[PDB]
Amino acid sequence: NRILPDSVDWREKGCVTEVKYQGSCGACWAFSAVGALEAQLKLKTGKLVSLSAQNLVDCSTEKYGNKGCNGGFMTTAFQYIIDNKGIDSDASYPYKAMDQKCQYDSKYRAATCSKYTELPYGREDVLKEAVANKGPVSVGVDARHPSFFLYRSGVYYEPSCTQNVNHGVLVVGYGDLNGKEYWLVKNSWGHNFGEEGYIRMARNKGNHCGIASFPSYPEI
């Protein structure tokens, strides 16, 4: 294993915004992407600002292989931000859990993206390195299993989990709790979900739930 901190929690560095509630809109990919960029924005500017998931839903659309409330890709959302030369703040372009016309306006720009990086498939130590050294990382997980919705505490391990990911989330940390290594995952089902919106997911257990399958992070 690479030489790295044994645990990381980007919330401690003030790099993680409040947990969002996607509602009945499959915008997790958008929340996942903005969350990663929010951390980078804080690292660069010193200011923590929620970015507009809705801007991605409405504007990072067919050209990017995305389908708004019917799903999308974090990577292509990043490329949209690059191509578009910005993304608006959440306050300026609030989330409505619906597909809308693109209403991007540069006057409400709160961040940019210059590039993004895809981590190699399934490599949890590479993921750990990126979380330690770069910041929160956008990932997909298999969140199809009934146990996921009912998670309350501890470290989530679901034998039925697969590497077929379907749910974009944000890895904001990692560590060990009571002998179980975990990834600290920010979800977008509001603070009622899991631990105030977070789930600790099993780490170094064979790419559990595909968490390390498709990681990416942007840079400002």
What residue segments make up the domains of the chain, in order of their start?
1-220
Which of 197, 177, 153 is closest to 6 using CA atoms? 177
Going by C-alpha positions, the residue among 86, 79, 90 that lies closest to residue 118 is 79
Q: How many CB atoms lie within 10 A of CB 63?
A: 11
Which pair of structure tokens corresponds to residue 218?
A: 């942007």
Q: Following CA atoms 78, 79, 83, 89 in sequence, which dihedral angle do they give, to the nearest 10 degrees?
A: -10
Cα separation, 139 vs 211, in Å, equals: 6
Choice among 55, 69, 161, 167 that is catalytic: 167
Method used for this model? X-ray
- In the residue annotation, 208 being an active-site residue is answered as no
Given 187, 207, 208, 209, which residue is catalytic? 187
Distance separating the N- and C-terminal Cα atoms of the chain: 28
Catalytic, 69? Answer no
CA distances to 36, 115, 129, 137 from 215, rounded to whole Å, are 11, 14, 12, 6
What is the spatial distance between Cα 164 and Cα 208, in angstroms, rounded to a whole number? 10
CATH number of 1-220: 3.90.70.10
Q: Which residue, chain included where needed, has tokens 């969350």?
A: 35
* Side-chain-facing half-sphere of 149: CA atoms under 13 Å: 3
Joined together, the tokens standing for residue 6 give 């044994």
- Joined together, the tokens standing for residue 144 give 């199809």
Partner residues linked to 117 by β-bridges: 217
Quick check: 63 and 77 in contact, CB under 8 A? no
- Catalytic annotation on 25? no
